[PDB]
Design a protein around this ligand. Structure first.
Ligand SMILES: NC(=O)C1=CN([C@@H]2O[C@H](COP(=O)(O)OP(=O)(O)OC[C@H]3O[C@@H](n4cnc5c(N)ncnc54)[C@H](OP(=O)(O)O)[C@@H]3O)[C@@H](O)[C@H]2O)C=CC1
Ligand SMILES: NC(=O)C1=CN([C@@H]2O[C@H](COP(=O)(O)OP(=O)(O)OC[C@H]3O[C@@H](n4cnc5c(N)ncnc54)[C@H](OP(=O)(O)O)[C@@H]3O)[C@@H](O)[C@H]2O)C=CC1
Ligand SMILES: NC(=O)C1=CN([C@@H]2O[C@H](COP(=O)(O)OP(=O)(O)OC[C@H]3O[C@@H](n4cnc5c(N)ncnc54)[C@H](OP(=O)(O)O)[C@@H]3O)[C@@H](O)[C@H]2O)C=CC1
Ligand SMILES: NC(=O)C1=CN([C@@H]2O[C@H](COP(=O)(O)OP(=O)(O)OC[C@H]3O[C@@H](n4cnc5c(N)ncnc54)[C@H](OP(=O)(O)O)[C@@H]3O)[C@@H](O)[C@H]2O)C=CC1
Lengths: 280, 280, 280, 280
């Protein structure tokens, strides 16, 4: 440590400045995932399936994840339609040994993992916490929506570090930045705020070998909000600047942006896709 | 619900607008805690003891909490020095039954609780997470620094709702807004970001009967940072606009502001006390 | 520059660490303004008058400012009621020469200025900008609500630097963080966001000799919102977690917190007093 | 307004919910600008030229803007290399009549404008403001970096409203979120914070007919930072989690994301591209 500029963030970067990547000079080539492997949790569900198919369209091999709804059909659909390799894996994301085994098997099956999306999650549907005295509900939210994200993150970081490259995207929510109304869901908001700032924290720790970012969707038309009444959804619309819920196909551009070489200087960022909801 | 303005936030507010409290005409009297009971977790430690003593100086009865460092002498010091009632209580904040029993016993011993400070916490000192396997350290941080805060909140909210009044303050950190460097501590930062947004979420849910806010300190000269080498602290000072660490006496004004009638329109807020650290 | 820790923020701090202030060990003494001089712009108006009187109650001499409504009566009320020195000054805050002359005269009249509140401001009342083609309205908002704040700031910083001490508070708004609805007021929101981050920027530049912070009120019952219809105010109430507008007397605790020795480690912070409005 | 869900944000949306657009089934086609016209201010300079060329690569006709550095050869380069229409225009962005005339002439020359990037800007290089008297430098920053951005926005909004579609991107900066060190530049930071919140405010006002977003770059290797000594840049690198400055090619993916149908539910958002700078 003489004659070196040492990072205040992370000395594993080595002597500063680090070298910039060599990129295509054409912007469209930056979004290609040809030659890359993506792994997407919760891809039996609405957002995860849309992201999985978009990544296959961009050229990636795709590992699909499910728990209570088998998705082998879905992996086979990607193989037949786009000619990529795709396989589906069953895993309860709450079980850290299962997450480790699943990610290790995917590395064997596909050779490596270049892009990881920690997307699986569940809602809180029980109203104000003051009336919920059984902590099982709190524990469930924290276990699936925070611990499960961390188990995925801890395991994939080791692969990214071994290979010297990677992009991790965590699906957070506008709930990590604001307090949803009129449905009261403090435990879910808490878990999502934790996810957003876990991502920023890992962006510093992993900077020598990977990027880490969040996508924070607003209200998207999937089954996850099927608990909402029609008067509840109407109030969401009234408070959304664009005046509606979004579709899953309006998220896939952002997931591909973060996954690909279009975003090689983007890390620790929270890409909000919410029709303006967090602005008013 | 005809001819009433209903809240989009919490319809338990009743017909809108709600009504403001009467307040002392002298600004200094707004800060008084005469006639009030405060309960401060982690008040065998640095910040918690300073807050407990400040609250006694402002006239409050004070319940003190400890775990590994018995604090009966601190409670006796408050009685002898300020003439308030004080008693110290042992509780592992990770144990939800013990938290419930301790808060119930304090309500019975003191009659009520008007002000609650969820302040107890532990640091992460293991360095970058990628090398910290099995999940015992992660679980310890989440258990004490998030679950313990939620156990306290769930229980005190019931007392505030029964009484129709209360102020809850959660000690978060600048680590809830930024990523500390060079000491890498993703799990701690994650827990504190969760704390900050749990407070905002509870501010909506408890609005008919209580206010909820956080204090986010920067680097304060206590023991929680004694893992810090001379060169690590020097870097903190270089990045702090005021050029130094803070004293616990520089926090107590903000804890008194939030606890008292000085802040009756303040809820869901994060009062940052950090020498400017989060600005660069 | 050998054998000194030099700040990365501001080398005028001198060798690090800077020295902590010597404070009272009693929390209530920290809020005293005895022996100090405060100057409050817009103190013919609602918020500024409440703050001026609170500072006099805390022991400060107070310089009052007006433009279209003379406030000599108000200064005399402070002298007769609290026994402090108080004088009122006429100044169009849009005129930089007038601001400089006013602040220079106050320094002569009172000896020094210890606390400055840049509070004067006007609303935008003309609806969506797309239909306002005369830039006079934009220029007015920027001139009074941003340039005027900067003219005050630039002048008072020179006094604070000469004396080595000072606290500057800028009245911003929740409009600096969110987008008000349903009244569309982009130019005012823009000016207030500028004020909030001007304060953070000056906190770094002035750190050797002064603190700089904002108060960001939510909806407060003053004349400034008298353009609002009753259906407009009802929607504000529906979106405010506490369910109502605030009173000016619910702000004065925060202004005294920031003005006094209760906040000597607080700089570059934005103290939000909004009934929770910015949370949902 | 009976039997219609009215917006609380902008009742010009009409009865809610609004309806989503049809989108290409292939994610890569979402990023195409074939058939579209883009207008990019400051595209004689570093970032602006990179964005203009990227938009031509994606198929757009491009209007180029310059002030002191004539750029007809850049426009001819886009025509010869990509087969798009391109023309360069001279305009002092501080002059509102000239901005209006330039945007009107581009609408006539190209037929319409679909994508507008308000990117032109100048730095503050005077150091701490306290020593910079008279207000000419402050006025220059506000005039170019805020007023000029507003003049562009006011005019293009009229075209977007007439056509019922459009995407406006404002180039802000990390300086809109944090306070740069060690180079002290409060007026620039103030202008960029204003830009970021002007964009959010316009996102609500323009929601029936356009999206509005910002790109906030960190330190990018262009000429705008040539005032920077070797030791100043070294400190920037030490505080940047990725350990380096970014390339303009690392920004164009984000500008294409926001300009195109990849982001039809994205409005009021701030896409930060900073190597992690705003996270510590
Ligand atoms: N839709 C929206 O409005 C928003 C959603 N989000 C987030 O988006 C992500 C996807 O949610 P979305 O697609 O909307 O809802 P879905 O319910 O459609 O998808 C949920 C997914 O999570 C998986 N999952 C649930 N629990 C577990 C578990 N214990 N172990 C493993 N996988 C599990 C499900 O797998 P299976 O069905 O096979 O059990 C399914 O694939 C979630 O993190 C959600 O919080 C964030 C913001 C807004
Ligand atoms: N720079 C700083 O000092 C900063 C601190 N903070 C936060 O401030 C709060 C106080 O920390 P500080 O006073 O600095 O550190 P201390 O270590 O001095 O105080 C720690 C306190 O937490 C209590 N505690 C620890 N574990 C448990 C447990 N399992 N159950 C119950 N109580 C427990 C300790 O009790 P005992 O000693 O009796 O076991 C002690 O009272 C913490 O939340 C910390 O994260 C935030 C920002 C900055
Ligand atoms: N009330 C609210 O809901 C909120 C208000 N604010 C901010 O609070 C501050 C005070 O506003 P408030 O008290 O509510 O409204 P008032 O209209 O009651 O007070 C306005 C004050 O500004 C002064 N002023 C206006 N223009 C000028 C000028 N050109 N030169 C000098 N002084 C001038 C007026 O002086 P005179 O009357 O003598 O001309 C008056 O003292 C403003 O910055 C406002 O933006 C922020 C958030 C919420
Ligand atoms: N690190 C960086 O480079 C960062 C830059 N930014 C922002 O990016 C944008 C581009 O800056 P960059 O490309 O880096 O710097 P350049 O100096 O390379 O580009 C400056 C551009 O602004 C134009 N311009 C300057 N003054 C005027 C004016 N009065 N009227 C019209 N056009 C004008 C110049 O035109 P001409 O040369 O023809 O006069 C040139 O096209 C700016 O808004 C800057 O604040 C934000 C974050 C980081």
């Amino acid at each position: 440590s003489m004659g070196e500029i040492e990072s205040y963030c992370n000395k594993e970067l080595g002597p500063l400045p680090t070298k910039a990547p060599t990129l295509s000079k054409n912007v469209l080539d930056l979004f290609s995932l040809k030659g890359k492997v993506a792994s997407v949790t919760g891809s039996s569900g609405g957002i995860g399936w849309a992201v999985a198919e978009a990544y296959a369209q961009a050229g990636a091999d795709v590992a699909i994840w499910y728990n209570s709804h088998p998705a082998d059909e879905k992996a086979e659909h990607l193989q037949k339609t786009y000619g990529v390799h795709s396989k589906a894996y069953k895993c309860n994301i709450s079980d850290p040994k299962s997450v480790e085994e699943t990610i290790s098997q995917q590395e064997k099956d596909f050779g490596t993992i270049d892009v990881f999306v920690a997307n699986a999650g569940v809602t809180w549907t029980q109203g104000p916490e003051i009336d919920v005295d059984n902590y099982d509900s709190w524990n469930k939210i924290i276990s699936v929506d925070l611990n499960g994200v961390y188990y995925c993150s801890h395991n994939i970081g080791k692969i990214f570090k071994k290979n010297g490259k990677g992009s991790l995207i965590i699906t957070s929510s506008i709930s990590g930045k604001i307090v949803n109304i009129p449905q009261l869901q403090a435990p879910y908001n808490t878990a999502k705020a934790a996810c957003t700032h876990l991502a920023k924290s890992l962006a510093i720790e992993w900077a020598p070998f990977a990027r880490v970012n969040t996508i924070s969707p607003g209200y998207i038309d999937t089954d996850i909000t099927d608990f909402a009444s029609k008067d509840m959804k109407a109030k969401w619309w009234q408070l959304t600047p664009l005046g509606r819920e979004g579709l899953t196909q309006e998220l896939v551009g952002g997931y591909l942006y973060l996954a690909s070489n279009a975003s090689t200087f983007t890390t620790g960022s929270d890409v909000v896709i919410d029709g303006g909801y967090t602005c008013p």
